[PDB]
Amino acid sequence: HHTDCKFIRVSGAELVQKYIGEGSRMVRELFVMAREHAPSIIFMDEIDSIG
Amino acid sequence: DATFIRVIGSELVQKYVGEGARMVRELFEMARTKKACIIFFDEIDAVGGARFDDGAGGDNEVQRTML
Amino acid sequence: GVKESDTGLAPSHLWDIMGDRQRLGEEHPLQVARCTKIIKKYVINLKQIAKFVVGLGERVSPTDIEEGMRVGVDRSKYNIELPLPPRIDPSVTMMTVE
Amino acid sequence: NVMLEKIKDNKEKIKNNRQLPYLVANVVEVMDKAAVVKTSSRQTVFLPMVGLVDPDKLKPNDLVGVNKDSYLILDTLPSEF
Amino acid sequence: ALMYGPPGTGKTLLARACAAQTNATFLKLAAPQLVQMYIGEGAKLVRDAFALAKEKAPTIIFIDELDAIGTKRFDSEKSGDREVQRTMLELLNQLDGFSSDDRVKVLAA
Amino acid sequence: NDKVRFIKDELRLLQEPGSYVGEVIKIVSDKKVLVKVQPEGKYIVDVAKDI
Amino acid sequence: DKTENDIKALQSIGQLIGEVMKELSEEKYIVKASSGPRYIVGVRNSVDRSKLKKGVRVTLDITTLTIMRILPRETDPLVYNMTSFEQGEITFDGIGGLTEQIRELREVIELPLKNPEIFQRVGIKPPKGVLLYGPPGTGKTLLAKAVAATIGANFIFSPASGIVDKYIGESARIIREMFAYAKEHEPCIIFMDEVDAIGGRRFSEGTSADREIQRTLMELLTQMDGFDNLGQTKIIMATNRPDTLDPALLRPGRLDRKVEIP
Amino acid sequence: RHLKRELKRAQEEVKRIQSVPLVIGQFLEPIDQNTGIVSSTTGMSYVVRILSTLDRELLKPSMSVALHRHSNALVDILPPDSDSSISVMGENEKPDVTYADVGGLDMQKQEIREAVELPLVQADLYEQIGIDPPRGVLLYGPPGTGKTMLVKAVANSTKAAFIRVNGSEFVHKYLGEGPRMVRDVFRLARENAPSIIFIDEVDSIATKRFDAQTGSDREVQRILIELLTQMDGFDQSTNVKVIMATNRADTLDPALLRPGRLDRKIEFPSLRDRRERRLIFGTIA
Ligand SMILES: Nc1ncnc2c1ncn2[C@@H]1O[C@H](COP(=O)(O)OP(=O)(O)OP(=O)(O)O)[C@@H](O)[C@H]1O
Ligand SMILES: Nc1ncnc2c1ncn2[C@@H]1O[C@H](COP(=O)(O)OP(=O)(O)OP(=O)(O)O)[C@@H](O)[C@H]1O
Ligand SMILES: Nc1ncnc2c1ncn2[C@@H]1O[C@H](COP(=O)(O)OP(=O)(O)OP(=O)(O)O)[C@@H](O)[C@H]1O
């Protein structure tokens, strides 16, 4: 909020994704939206407690 | 100088079952029409596996394209 | 830019005499369909899902019309003009031939 | 001789509509006397049934031809395959 | 009537020769066709292999292979056996007695 | 007088042969614009003398 | 006259069916056509405004679009093919040696149907729902013919793999219309035969076909038990292996008796 | 005086265009106010002039509307009460279950009289303390817990409008049908506030895994995205935000359960104790 980053919470959620429909191979597209709209914080919560 | 028709045997696989059924049919007709052909199936260890029945996996898609 | 570069080049100017009297003809379009039943007249199924009974063309032999064959039919009132070879699934099988 | 030319009169009209082309639809229900068909253009139309076409051939599900221009049951056809 | 055993015993070769020789109308069917990728097109192919066969009855449907739909597995846990098994059960309904199917036979190899 | 002449002409303006919402995929330096009609397929079509 | 009746049909045209979706005012009604788009239309004055209500089918004009008149409810072409199968009948006897099990199915079906006065006085809510399961080859199916012949109430034999179609959302709309159908024609019995097709469980990580099942099965679950509770419907369900079933169909209070045929 | 005859002859003309036959679209948003974007009910977008001399007071928030046929012009507006997916059920007779037939589950009964009943009758107790009332209510458990029985019990006593629907009423079968019905249900509720909205089962719609390679995945998914954006608008209206239930809570999509839409999770136990099993026997006895 102070730095003026777009806070993009990424999560494994495919509800928001509709253009490619999965984030397994989305890399360039998340960068190219966050590079236009820099500055950005991509908050990668990797869960790693799913058993 | 007889028509050569290369296939990749691991090109057939998709998630929607018997999707490689359509392919295998139409390829077989396309080779039937031209006279003197050779149909060269490489790398048929995928779709060319042993006769087995796991009882729990997804070997059911795989064994469609073989039958 | 691409500054207006479109294939054709120097012979396509002589083609413009021949291809302007045919382009206005209804030779094309023939909405491509496919037969579902020869009833000893013919039953086609369009690929939009809407079924029609059509009939012979200008001089086509009754041997041409076969089961599961595609045919082109008159754009307006449906009638077989020119039969066409079978199945539009071949195309992933013609790129495998070296 | 005057009556016989009234049957020919009707029939030359009837011969022009009977020939190709005509949409193909099936019979939702016979409501009786009325025939409701759901077409292969995926709507529905309530029509006064053609009486030259028997109400015997028209049973629920039957496959019948229908004229596009005026939705009337034109003729009967053996169920496709 | 079912034909099973080792390969090479001419199972597929005999059946054909004797079903065309006796002038009983011999339909050619291969089980891998009843498998489909559309949802509900395999259930519409079985009823349509049946509806043709009630008219010309008695007639012989010869199924070459039967391991395409003949999986014991239809208690499964996340597989495409939920679409395949739907054309096996539409079989057992179009094999129950309702007359005008009392006269359809079956070979299966 | 202005008022009864707003109504008579608003009857002409309200008649629309048709108007869509498209979106510019990409321009081409032919003075044409590749516009995707948003439910349908694509159409390449040039600009008016307004833009 | 036989050629003259055809000329009197020819001057007619189809009249698009709808139903009255919702009264807007006194002189405008909204219909939902069967081609698709909702319209706002006018009324012929032959028919009162009280005869119309929301959910009566109406015919419409070609292009002017006016309600012409009220029609009875349209009946599906699928629900006429299911009523037809009764060929193979047999009376009370079915599986000989299991006449005790034949009485257990009549306790659920034939006794409150004929005399609802025996279940009023005792005070248990009327039953409904029977599952048949056993070693395959045992005549689960022969008993279904025995209880549809003798009772004489309307029977509808609906194979479960024979209502999945290519179109999706069409296997929901059909089977909704059948539970209405069983209320109108009461008493009525719906025999679901070979329920192993739509017996897939939660899953919905595999193919998109596995989510066609789950979406068509949720609608059978809230239609069977929800706010909805249709009193004049009985369900008899035939299944081979009784462990395919989703754990919402194992579940008593859906399905009073869980009969095992030995 | 002659021009007063001519204002009347021009006023007549235009009222005939206002009235029947009309197709029903929807207003998305203005781009001016004499021109707007409507989606017809053919599944296409049109840019249409707006008949001046109309109320934009209810128009600007998205809401049903009437359009002309050939012309395609917005000739008048329709109430948000009119052209709704479902007539309200609070005017029909009340569900047959009352609180005499609820037996046990007395622990979930004190968490539902607070969450549902109290914010309709008295909005002024929450605000003056300074607490926000719970927004959406979730019910989850094994499939026999008699979730629905508790909801019927609270529906008879409130005597406020009710709207009851399923999650396979929204099933896709025309183009763009699925997104259209979600708008109609949230706009009826604000119009006749207060009310309780129940969606009975929502296990098929909320999926944890989409791939969006088939059309039927793109219709399910357009519905669910629309449902989040309409629960946001629904905040600060007397209606207690949508109650919904699921039988297996482990397919629940993460954006749905996130706060701002659903806040409370009324678990329905099935072990219970000896004083709460007794009661279940006593009302069926
Ligand atoms: N009993 C037999 N007598 C004469 N020829 C035989 C016999 N069995 C097999 N053959 C020969 O073997 C050939 C191949 O047999 P075919 O492939 O039809 O049998 P199969 O049991 O169906 O084996 P598979 O299907 O496993 O390939 C036959 O065309 C025939 O020439
Ligand atoms: N109890 C019985 N009394 C008389 N005949 C029987 C009996 N059980 C089975 N049959 C015979 O077996 C045939 C097929 O059995 P049926 O199809 O009714 O069994 P099922 O349990 O429904 O098996 P499936 O549905 O797995 O095919 C019957 O059509 C009938 O000839
Ligand atoms: N506390 C109780 N008192 C009296 N009866 C009860 C009680 N709890 C459950 N029941 C009985 O169990 C039945 C089924 O439960 P209910 O109709 O409320 O559906 P549900 O459990 O929510 O199912 P769904 O999974 O389809 O949402 C009720 O109709 C009722 O007869």
Ligand SMILES: [Mg+2]
């Ligand atoms: Mg063989």
Ligand SMILES: [Mg+2]
């Ligand atoms: Mg059976």
Ligand SMILES: [Mg+2]
């Ligand atoms: Mg419930």
